[PDB]
Paper text:
In one conformation the 9-1-1 ring is closed, but in the other the ring is wide open with a 27-Å gap. The most striking feature is that the DNA is bound only by the Rad24 subunit in an extended groove on its AAA+ module and extending to the collar domain. In both closed and open 9-1-1 clamp states, the first four interfaces (Rad24:Rfc4, Rfc4:Rfc3, Rfc3:Rfc2 and Rfc2:Rfc5) are occupied by ATPγS and Mg2+, and an adenosine diphosphate (ADP) occupies the last interface between Rfc5 and the A′ subdomain of Rad24. Strikingly, the 9-1-1 ring is planar in both the closed and open states of the Rad24-RFC–9-1-1 clamp–DNA complex. The Rad24-RFC complex conformation is essentially unchanged in the 9-1-1–DNA open and closed states.
The 9-1-1 DNA checkpoint clamp is loaded onto 5′-recessed DNA to activate the DNA damage checkpoint that arrests the cell cycle. Rad24 replaces Rfc1 and loads the DNA damage 9-1-1 ring onto DNA to signal DNA damage. Unlike RFC, which encircles DNA, Rad24 binds 5′-DNA on its surface, not inside the loader, and threads the 3′ ssDNA overhang into the 9-1-1 clamp from above the ring.
Numbering used by the authors:
A (entry chain B): 7 to 323
B (entry chain C): 9 to 333
C (entry chain G): 135 to 268
D (entry chain D): 24 to 353
E (entry chain A): 63 to 130, 146 to 495
F (entry chain E): 1 to 120, 134 to 354
Write the structure that this text describes.
Amino acid sequence: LQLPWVEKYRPQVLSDIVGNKETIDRLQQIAKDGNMPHMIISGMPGIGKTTSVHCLAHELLGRSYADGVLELNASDDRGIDVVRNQIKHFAQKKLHLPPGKHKIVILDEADSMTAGAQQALRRTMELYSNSTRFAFACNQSNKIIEPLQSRCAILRYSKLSDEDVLKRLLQIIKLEDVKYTNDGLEAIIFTAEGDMRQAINNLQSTVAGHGLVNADNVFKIVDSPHPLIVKKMLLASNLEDSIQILRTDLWKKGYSSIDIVTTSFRVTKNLAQVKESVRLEMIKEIGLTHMRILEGVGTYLQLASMLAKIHKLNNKA
Amino acid sequence: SKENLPWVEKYRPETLDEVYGQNEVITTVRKFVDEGKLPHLLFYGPPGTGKTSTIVALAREIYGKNYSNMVLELNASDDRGIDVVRNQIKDFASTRQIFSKGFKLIILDEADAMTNAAQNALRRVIERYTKNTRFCVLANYAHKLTPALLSRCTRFRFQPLPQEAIERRIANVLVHEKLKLSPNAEKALIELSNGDMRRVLNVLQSCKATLDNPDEDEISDDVIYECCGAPRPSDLKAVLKSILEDDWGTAHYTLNKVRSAKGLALIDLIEGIVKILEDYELQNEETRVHLLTKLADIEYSISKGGNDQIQGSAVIGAIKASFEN
Amino acid sequence: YLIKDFDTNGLELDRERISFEAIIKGEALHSALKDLKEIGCKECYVYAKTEANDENVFALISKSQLGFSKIKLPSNRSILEKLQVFDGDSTTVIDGFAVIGFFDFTSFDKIRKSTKIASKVLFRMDVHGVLSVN
Amino acid sequence: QQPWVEKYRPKNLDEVTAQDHAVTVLKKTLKSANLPHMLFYGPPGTGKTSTILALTKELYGPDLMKSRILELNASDERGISIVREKVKNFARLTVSKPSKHDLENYPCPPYKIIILDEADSMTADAQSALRRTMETYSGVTRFCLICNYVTRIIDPLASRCSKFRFKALDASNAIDRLRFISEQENVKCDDGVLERILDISAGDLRRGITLLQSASKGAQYLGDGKNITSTQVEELAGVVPHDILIEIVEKVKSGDFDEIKKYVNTFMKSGWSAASVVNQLHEYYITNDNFDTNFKNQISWLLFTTDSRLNNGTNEHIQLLNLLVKISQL
Amino acid sequence: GEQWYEKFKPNCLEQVAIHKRKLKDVQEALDAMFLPNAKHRILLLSGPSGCSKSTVIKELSKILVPKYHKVTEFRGDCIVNDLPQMESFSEFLKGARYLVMSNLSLILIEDLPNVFHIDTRRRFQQLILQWLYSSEPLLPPLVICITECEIPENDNNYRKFGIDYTFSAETIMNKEILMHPRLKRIKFNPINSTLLKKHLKFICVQNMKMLKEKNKWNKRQEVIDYIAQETGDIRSAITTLQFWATSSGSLPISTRESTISYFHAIGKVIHGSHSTNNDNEMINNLFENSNNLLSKEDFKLGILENYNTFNKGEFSISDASSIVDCLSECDNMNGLPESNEYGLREVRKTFRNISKQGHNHGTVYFPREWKVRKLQNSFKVQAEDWLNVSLYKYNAVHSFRNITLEFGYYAPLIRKCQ
Amino acid sequence: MSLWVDKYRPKSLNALSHNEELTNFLKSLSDQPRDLPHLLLYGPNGTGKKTRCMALLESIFGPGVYRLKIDVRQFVTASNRKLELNVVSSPYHLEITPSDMGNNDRIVIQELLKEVAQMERYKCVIINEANSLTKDAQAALRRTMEKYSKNIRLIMVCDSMSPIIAPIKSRCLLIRCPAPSDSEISTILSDVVTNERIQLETKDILKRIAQASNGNLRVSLLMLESMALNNELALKSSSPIIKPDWIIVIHKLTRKIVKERSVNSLIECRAVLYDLLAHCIPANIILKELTFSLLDVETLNTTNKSSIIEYSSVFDERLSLGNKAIFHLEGFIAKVMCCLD
DNA sequence: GCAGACACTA
DNA sequence: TAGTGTCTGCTTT
Ligand SMILES: Nc1ncnc2c1ncn2[C@@H]1O[C@H](COP(=O)(O)OP(=O)(O)OP(O)(O)=S)[C@@H](O)[C@H]1O
Ligand SMILES: Nc1ncnc2c1ncn2[C@@H]1O[C@H](COP(=O)(O)OP(=O)(O)OP(O)(O)=S)[C@@H](O)[C@H]1O
Ligand SMILES: Nc1ncnc2c1ncn2[C@@H]1O[C@H](COP(=O)(O)OP(=O)(O)OP(O)(O)=S)[C@@H](O)[C@H]1O
Ligand SMILES: Nc1ncnc2c1ncn2[C@@H]1O[C@H](COP(=O)(O)OP(=O)(O)OP(O)(O)=S)[C@@H](O)[C@H]1O
Ligand SMILES: Nc1ncnc2c1ncn2[C@@H]1O[C@H](COP(=O)(O)OP(=O)(O)O)[C@@H](O)[C@H]1O
Ligand SMILES: [Mg+2]
Ligand SMILES: [Mg+2]
Ligand SMILES: [Mg+2]
Ligand SMILES: [Mg+2]
């Protein structure tokens, strides 16, 4: 029964959590003071939001959090009536809490919860904010309605830098006592793209499939991310080079055409070097190829035509 | 159980060693199960690679007699809504062992069709109940999957089947049923496979019925090309040569004669021409742009329907005009 | 429907490692299950404990939005025929030991009507955690 | 009695005339029980429905039509839930029990066949749901997909189902069949009427059969006892006369917009279908050897564009006027 | 401890964050409602969150009820034992109806019942309509506060009709209650920069001992003015100020980043954003901000109708033709996110190219498609009546196309002479 | 009664004043009704294809074809949305009303064709304007006429049959109904004015009506009706040929586009287009009429006309797939202004 | 975002 | 007194 590294090596205190020094320091300060108001935590997945909330609740309450709170996550019936009733009962049932401590309502993955439940939560806060406090763990703050965010201090988690992920990887390697190579670690960081959970999964797979962590083994088990390949494809000068890159990196690797079109659209949205006219022309061509793919024609000829038209509009004769 | 099923579901692998092509994935999964750790395997690739066959063989090898009870199979055939993932998956991935302390495997085949709320509930399930139950996700389109799910699942890429895997499977099929196949037909099947085992098995099943005598004879290029209907490479080369040197009259006559001699399709001719023209050296890139754009437009029009003669003359005119640069 | 009948199956158990056994009347258990359903109690607990003074303890307690519910089944021999707790060998009876079972409410709701018309109900579970109800 | 399309519909596998490969594969399957999932595709009116009906008749028989055959079409609701539940219910039924007469007479396979016509117009979600039902339940059931649009069927379905292309029914592919029909129905042709009918027809035999029936009815009504000529089938087929096409070409040759527009209006007020006019103009322009390569390529591209526009459900008058104006200005 | 916005609640009418005109025209509105005969039976308040839409009425009831603090605020989280939520609001209205004398308790429905199911949404309209035309002596005041916030996009919404797109008074309320004679709609605006700055001054000087403990007394002015200018919500401003004051330092504070409006987005696409000079980042941020509005019909029509107001229709005709052609080409992509991006990008690029001749602009108009549909329905029912009356004495089959094209003018002309 | 469209309608098959080739062809078809296959009619609007269908039904069935039999049927789509259709009934045949929306068109066709079929002579179904279907109803008709081709006959009349899918065109016999020449329309009008003995000094007005309606029987008859009732049943050679508000509005819009080419002119064109489109009309015929009126301007040269017709074809293609119509209409108008300026 | 009209002291 | 700050629009079966 070997527990996976994502769950076995998850942090239990806020000290082990790295990536945003200011936010962790703020969480430690607000736990030491104990005056924790409502907050919303948002960011790209795999950065350490829900584990940070759990660790904060742990080292803020202890036995009280362990025994006498009601934590709800996405794996429950999040209907309006049942959630209303559950949070209404949880707002009651006060204990001999310390004067600087309050109940915490952990809300994990609240982006998919219905608007009526948000209104019921609004009423619950406006009626019993004195006894309990709410904590929100989500990906983006747009899915939360406007009135909820006015009663809370929104905290944003930035993407983890390479230094913090590398430090965590070295700590986990020292804990596991496994050989490593600097090239392999650099490849792991490059493949992760700031995703801590993906980096942990890749390192665990490398360790359990090849032993020593090396760049060659990592590249063998997992290839380069497709956004980088598509970005290099769109920035290619010659059409033949772009066609060869497309074929040898997506057609021979087993990549669906619709996924390639979606990645091209995402890259073109976030591209910055191209001009506005070139960007909109590329977006139009990507959309035309996407509707052609959706209507049924899912062959490589459509991708080749998209690349040819993109090169033609880039060169402009 | 055998000799009563289609060839696709007749040579389905039952063990891990019977899966060919993705040797690295098989070795990595074997190391994972030898160490005793399943890191929420996620399989991605084109259809026909063998993701579900591999995962079913792996589950059989791990479990044995516990496949009936502890292994759960999920698909798009049954209802997969918010209530289904909320109740059935939660109830199944909450139980203890019965005879062996092995992990719990849940097969999410073609899981790309699930709703966003269902995907979010599923990923909150995988995060919470990971200490005893490990899920497996199978999909062909990664754009339909929530990016949070990909972070929590170890992604494994299923490459198209290489030439050696197709040749080994062809040899295994031939030995089992005592069938002889010519090396030219083998090369034709390698070219036509395009990294698909199901297509190879389907065309091999039909070529057996094409021959009047199942035994005491071989399968040549003519039988393979007549069975599926793919154009011969010689026919494609002759059509391209006629287009290149003859402008419209004898070129159109040759194209019509080739198409009417056997019943060739415009589409298959289009992939034949693009395949034999991809290796051409054209240092202007305007010919390449024009050829790609016009051929894609013609293929789209054929997919939408139209006149066969009109589309064939359109192909001829596009090829002639593009090469004029 | 006999196409993909996987056969075998069976949530059976071995009698060599039975944690404890209990025999109770159907009427006594039906009242407990009926009260357990309408109140809610999405998570339920099974407690088994023997006493040297023959004061055996067995109850179906649960937690819900109401709080803590303690449906204490009777301990006398009038409607509780037999109750002993084993040490994982099904032959070595031990007194003072407690067996705690964490069961879902959905499983309990299925046997509520089964015990509505019954004479004797037999409870048996092992160390593996599976429960057999006769 | 019955129209010749349905009266002369094939009932046996050997009654076909052009699709040799699929029919002989099914015939060699008749002595076995390893029939795979089939994907029938090709031009309209090539007999895919006739082929599957004949195969079913050879396999099961009229007694087993009502017990081992399920057909789902566009005539009823084809939603995701209804199709899902119906396919799951029928693809789970046990093997039927044939009588001793059925086993003695016909070779009864141990499986059942599910036929899904016009599968092109089926949503992708339904096909995704049906993928696993086709795959893991295929022990004693099979699925047949018939559709004239290959691209409308997604990639996973094209892999599980064996691809059986149906050849376009050209002239020599159906000359014998039309000759047999003419002898059976007592239809007289002088030199090349049947060949002309297949030339007019777009690679199908049903339209040709309907045209032959109309010509025979007209000849019977006329009652003079003469044979059908090519002019009669050309007139009843909507074929533009050669003189009018020559006039169209001559007016296009002259570089005047007003006369061209007036003649286009006069041609369109006759209500003639623009597709036939486009095809006749295209074949005349390619057949003519008085034009160079660049003009031929340009006019072929414009004709292809106009054909796509017309097939996309646009106005015939505007499209034909634009095509003739573009041709005149080359 | 205690929230700053809760411990610093206003106690008089001079501490609430509201404009003088808004205070005046809610005071005159509420004063006339307390009379036995009132022109407006109920009061409707619509505006953004945190705009003093409820506290102002709270002290207003505090200083008007004792003339003849009695507030009957509806609690939607009540269940009421074995009572459906649909009938709960019906019982609340009749329970608070019997307060016309002696008690005189004002009704403040801040938390309206959730209206998302078909049955419960339709019930909400006639429940207040039955209370309007009821011929009963006297009248207790009733104030309904509705927050204007758009509901975020969800999955598998099927037809994707109204209400669920944006939770606003116009979407849920029907036409009968919107322009009812016995109803006043007093809109609300976000808190001004001056009022927010004054309130933050008051909070800072009230918390002088806490702020002077750390190194925040010198830095407070920049933080508070940035907070006041960044958002118009007083509650969010107080929350951010409390978080910053509790914070030791070196922490970048965050704000809700409230979504922009429909006409605001239209102006952003046509004119441009001064905050973001770069064109690429403006559209990309707007997409992730409100995709729920861009991936919706009538927005492209709004761009089509308001693009001639850039220079009062005095710009390049070729540029206008290119813009309209690009929108028409976008319309063929079956309403995809890629389709919306290309057309808006082209419009913004063109208007940036011709931005030099943009000194004077015009007003934008939301497209009149509802009127076109209404006249279409009227013509449809008129044609149905014409076919019904013309088929009872003879036979006439010409399909619907010939009636609209040929018989739409010839047929009335012939009957005019006869 | 009210109009010449329905009053002096040709009852018998032998009372047709148009060309006799089509009449002889349909008489040959109607000689053996048992062997008659599914039929499809294509031609210009107003030619009278429904008259040929009624004459064929008279030849096959006999007297009693024209029966009112107004019936109302209720149909239920997915979820919950009641639909109403005032379908017309008749003994031995039934006519389909295509007035329902294209999206929810499968339910009505499927239910009513199953109701006419049942299991059981045959009952014929007439389906006018079959081009409005979104190919789903077309597939439904295809399957219905394939599977149940023992007791059902489909006779569909339509104009510009290009949107009709290829499989349907293969399974149905093609009937061509060309519009009559000016001589036949003049003869019909002369027969009408002789029947009612109205005043007529010069026959040039009859030729003017015949040539001004573009070979349309209904349009010519209604134009004759409008001027006859407005002139006390006394036609005059000096009486101008009047046109509906449709043609006047189209010509005024064309003149405004040709004269004024500006963004203000564009928004007034938008207002005119919205006022036109507020009457439940398809935009394809509006685009065709605008293109034909633009090509009739004498001041334009061949290059402007070629550009106008090319962009008209392009925007008609765009309108073919587009959900809206105002976008493509304004695009075509703006392109025309750009070319003219 | 922008046009039209008002509050308020610099 | 001319600038700077800010309310109303600009919206439906
Ligand atoms: N700063 C960190 N230091 C160490 N491990 C981390 C850190 N951030 C994330 N992890 C690891 O990430 C895994 C799960 O993190 P999560 O908090 O669940 O991801 P997330 O950022 O919350 O994204 P979502 O929305 O939950 S999918 C665990 O294995 C953690 O150990
Ligand atoms: N590597 C392989 N070696 C041998 N046979 C294979 C291999 N991959 C696929 N096959 C055969 O292909 C058949 C169909 O492939 P499956 O594994 O069932 O489906 P899949 O390849 O995973 O594609 P999807 O995603 O399910 S559509 C199997 O039953 C095998 O007979
Ligand atoms: N090989 C053939 N020999 C003789 N008649 C044939 C043959 N193929 C087709 N037919 C004729 O074609 C008609 C049957 O064709 P269908 O099967 O209905 O058309 P289809 O194949 O279904 O085309 P679809 O479904 O519209 S794509 C009958 O009139 C047959 O006589
Ligand atoms: N000077 C002030 N003026 C107004 N509100 C203040 C002030 N000082 C503190 N507050 C608080 O700010 C909040 C504003 O409340 P309101 O905006 O009236 O409520 P609301 O408008 O109903 O909010 P929603 O949209 O319903 S969640 C209350 O919690 C007040 O106690
Ligand atoms: N052979 C004919 N002789 C005289 N009038 C005819 C003839 N055929 C049709 N019509 C006229 O056509 C009118 C009906 O046209 P209609 O069937 O509505 O055209 P469409 O079928 O194109 O809609 C009738 O009023 C009738 O007077
Ligand atoms: Mg989380
Ligand atoms: Mg699979
Ligand atoms: Mg068919
Ligand atoms: Mg409030």
